[PDB]
Design a protein around this nucleic acid. Structure first.
Lengths: 149, 83, 185, 83, 129
RNA sequence: UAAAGUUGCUGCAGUUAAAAAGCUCGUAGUUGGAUCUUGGGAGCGGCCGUCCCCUGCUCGGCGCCGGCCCGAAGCGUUUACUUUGAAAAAA
């Protein structure tokens, strides 16, 4: 069951049993990391990196090929973003909605969906403060939000 | 039926079922040796691509994204590779 | 010769002879650059049930993936040398005990009883790879792990199955069988 | 059902389903006791002995009684294993 | 959401045996389910089962007789002294002649009758008869 | 007080008998997925049962040509839990 919907969807990605790398994949773990760096430098998220990789370069899971996963490869060298991509995207969506709702006070549905998105943010913020990957001093305020692109 | 071989699903029954609900979890995707006739190189494309996989050294654009499986452009062939 | 014991001690004349048999492959055959840096930690001769013997070669863990490239290539020459025996290549996985009330750094999941007994089994059967574990918890209460190896390399490595079951049984004490599921892949 | 001295004291020992082991109560009138006759393995005639089967009314009302006799006659050798 | 995984298991094999199934898939798996089942097996209530290893939590496939009248969880896992264990088997089993409270002691997950002779109480997991 | 399972932890009810907030978000409250040790060594009864073992470094007694076996301190993830012990006026 979804967080802020009645939806009981089951559209999950389903990894195979065999964590063992396939045969055909000729790229060594280092050249995969080198290509991950090349994608990160272009300005892509670990989500967008992983998609571009498995599509055009036949690398199912970076964790399967290498040891580690894409953010931890970004983070080790310091190509990772300061605030997480998923909490970035909710703040990005909240600034989009709030801009729409500046000149559309009639749009009561928007206003309700804003409160649902605000709740997704506060909920993730609270999680990342327990894991100290955000400052304890940090708090998403909608007036301070437009600077956080 | 009361008695079902729950440990031994016949492969007609297993491939029928939802990927998550299979006795052991198993995807419905696969990697393709997609080759265009204009170019020399065999590119590895993911079946459910969801991007525009291009020919590196542009002779064409290979696949186009849809709901599920991507459309392989007319002219292109595919072998499904496995381990 | 190439048998670098983990403790400050000596190998046996059998074990030093196996490491000289790896020098015999180095200073003759063309896999010589891929035997220079590759050391050995131990080796044992394991008497399985019936009138059969196998040989088991423990390996340095970071050098294991170098063996995985050159496995069957090398296994041929070491197996014809010790003709009637089966030769198998496991890494020496150090295995820390469960940190108790009574008894310092966090014991990592790599260096754990289950991950040792499962990573050994993964690189026990090498040419075939495991496509599902099943476990009969039988009426008496004892487990019987049923390892479903790949359908490819069935004709290659079926003869080593009742070896593999013995190799793992003598190591961990866990009663194992190896099967081949044909109906999927 | 047996006392400190070891005596069977209950006034009858019940039958129970040859399928699902459910004891077959005194007033279960749906319950089906069948005699399946066996045959001389070269002549093909009634020998005089049978492989008797008993189902509780409950499984019979479910409609699974068919498959449950079919299993009990397959694992008994009466029916072809190939089938 | 799923919170007591031992609840999902015991209710699913209870549902299944009431239906008359020869075996039942119980499609999350924990070490506590596996110890509970082995206790039900040692007293012959369920048949020799099987733990399917995917690389997530397992799935178990449990051969059934028609001996298990009901298995069940007590949630929450109340603490049981050796004093109290009479009052549980008094109100939670169908007789003194049979039925077994499983309770996780320090010695291990086991029936109430072994928790007597080992002289160790602990937390009630469930019961079966 | 029991009867009262008509206050319901054990143990009640909430479609129509009394009863689910108009709907949703939401903080304290409450509840929270899987996963991290096992095989055997020693011994007895007739394959199965009941026992001992699977942390380490200052002071002396069953002894030995500075230390080996062991005895007594002191540091040893932290709690709930369970078992034992001390202690807990009688009436």
């Amino acid at each position: 069951g979804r967080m802020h919907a009645p939806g009981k969807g089951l559209s999950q990605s389903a990894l195979p049993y065999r964590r063992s790398v396939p045969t055909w994949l000729k790229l060594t773990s280092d050249d995969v990391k080198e290509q991950i760096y090349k994608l990160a430098k272009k300005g892509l998220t670990p989500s967008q990196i992983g998609v571009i990789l498995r599509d055009s370069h036949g690398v199912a899971q970076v964790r399967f090929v290498t040891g580690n996963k894409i953010l931890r490869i970004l983070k080790s060298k310091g190509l990772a973003p300061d605030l997480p991509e998923d909490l970035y995207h909710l703040i990005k969506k909240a600034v989009a909605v709030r801009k729409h709702l500046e000149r559309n006070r009639k749009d009561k549905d928007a206003k309700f969906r804003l409160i649902l998105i605000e709740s997704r943010i506060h909920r993730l913020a609270r999680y990342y403060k327990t894991k100290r990957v955000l400052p304890p001093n940090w708090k998403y305020e909608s007036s301070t939000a437009s600077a956080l692109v | 039926p009361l008695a079902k071989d729950l440990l031994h699903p016949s492969p007609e029954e297993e491939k029928r079922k939802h990927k998550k609900k299979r006795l052991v979890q198993s995807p419905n995707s696969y990697f393709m040796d997609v080759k265009c006739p204009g170019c020399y190189k065999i590119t590895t494309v993911f079946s459910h691509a969801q991007t525009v996989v291009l020919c590196v050294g542009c002779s064409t654009v290979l696949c186009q994204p849809t709901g599920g499986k991507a459309r392989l452009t007319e002219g292109c062939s595919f072998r499904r590779k496995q381990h | 010769a190439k048998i670098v014991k983990p403790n400050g001690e000596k190998p046996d004349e059998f074990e030093s002879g196996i490491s000289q048999a790896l020098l015999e492959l180095e200073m003759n055959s063309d896999l010589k650059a891929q035997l220079r840096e590759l050391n050995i930690t131990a080796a044992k001769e394991i008497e399985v049930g019936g009138g059969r013997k196998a040989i088991i070669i423990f390996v340095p863990v970071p050098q294991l993936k170098s063996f995985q490239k050159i496995q069957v290539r090398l296994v041929r020459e070491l197996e014809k040398k010790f003709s009637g025996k089966h030769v198998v290549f496991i890494a020496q996985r150090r295995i820390l005990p469960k940190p108790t009330r009574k008894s310092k750094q966090k014991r990592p999941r790599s260096r754990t009883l289950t991950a040792v007994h499962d990573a050994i089994l993964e690189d026990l059967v090498f040419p075939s790879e495991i496509v599902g574990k099943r476990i009969r918890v039988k009426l008496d209460g004892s487990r019987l792990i049923k390892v479903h190896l790949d359908k490819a390399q069935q004709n290659n490595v079926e003869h080593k199955v009742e070896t593999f079951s013995g190799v793992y049984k003598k190591l961990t004490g866990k009663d194992v069988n190896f099967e081949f599921p044909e109906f999927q892949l | 059902m047996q006392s400190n001295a070891g005596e069977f004291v209950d006034l009858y020992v019940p039958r129970k389903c040859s399928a699902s082991n459910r004891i077959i109560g005194a007033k279960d009138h749906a319950s089906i006791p069948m005699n399946v006759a066996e045959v001389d393995k070269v002549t093909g005639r009634f020998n005089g002995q049978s492989k008797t089967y008993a189902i509780c009314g409950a499984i019979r009302r479910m409609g699974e009684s068919d498959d449950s006799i079919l299993r009990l006659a397959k694992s008994h050798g009466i029916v072809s294993q190939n089938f | 959401v799923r919170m007591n995984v031992l609840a999902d298991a015991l209710k699913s094999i209870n549902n299944a045996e009431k239906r008359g199934k020869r075996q039942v898939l119980i499609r999350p798996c924990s070490k506590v389910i596996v110890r509970f089942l082995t206790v039900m097996m040692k007293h012959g209530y369920i048949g020799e089962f099987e733990i399917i290893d995917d690389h997530r939590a397992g799935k178990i496939v449990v051969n059934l007789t028609g001996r298990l009248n009901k298995c069940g969880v007590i949630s929450p896992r109340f603490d049981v002294q050796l004093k109290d264990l009479e009052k549980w088997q008094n109100n939670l089993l169908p007789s003194r002649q049979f039925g077994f409270i499983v309770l996780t002691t320090s010695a291990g997950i086991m029936d109430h009758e072994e928790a007597r002779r080992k002289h160790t109480g602990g937390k009630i997991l469930g019961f079966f008869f």
